């Protein structure tokens, strides 16, 4: 199994990013994806989830109305577009996939984590 991060650098308050995460050997029954990110010394906090199931969303409040998360089925890679960025948002992504059955936690696998980079 691999979650291989893509898209990350530096960019102005105000512009426009897109992440990446192709995910290999996780099965598709319900599986759900997302992104995280860490700012230094601060603590991994959660950023928005797709459930692939479906394609239903979900955002932090931080990130609703700025961020859309998207998945491309048939290439298994999903996506984040972040666009009117702010410095806040500078941090480590990390990418994540899991699977939840009976409460049990099935599986869940991260990515190594992509820097992003907003300067003022």
């Known amino acids: 199994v691999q979650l291989v991060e893509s898209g990350g650098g530096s960019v102005q308050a105000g512009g426009s990013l897109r992440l990446s995460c192709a995910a290999s050997?996780?099965?598709?029954?319900?599986?759900?994806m997302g992104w995280f990110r860490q700012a230094p010394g601060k603590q991994r906090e959660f950023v928005a989830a797709?459930?692939?199931?479906?394609?239903?969303?979900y955002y932090a409040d931080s990130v609703k109305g700025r961020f859309t998360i998207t998945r491309d089925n048939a290439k298994n890679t999903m996506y984040l577009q972040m666009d009117s960025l702010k410095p806040e948002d500078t941090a480590v992504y990390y990418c994540?996939?899991?699977?939840?059955?009976?409460?049990?936690?099935?599986?869940?696998?991260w990515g190594q984590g992509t820097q992003v980079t907003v300067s003022s």
């Open positions: 994540n996939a899991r699977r939840i059955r009976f409460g049990v936690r099935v599986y869940d696998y």
């Open positions: 050997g996780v099965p598709s029954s319900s599986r759900v």
């Open positions: 797709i459930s692939w199931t479906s394609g239903n969303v």
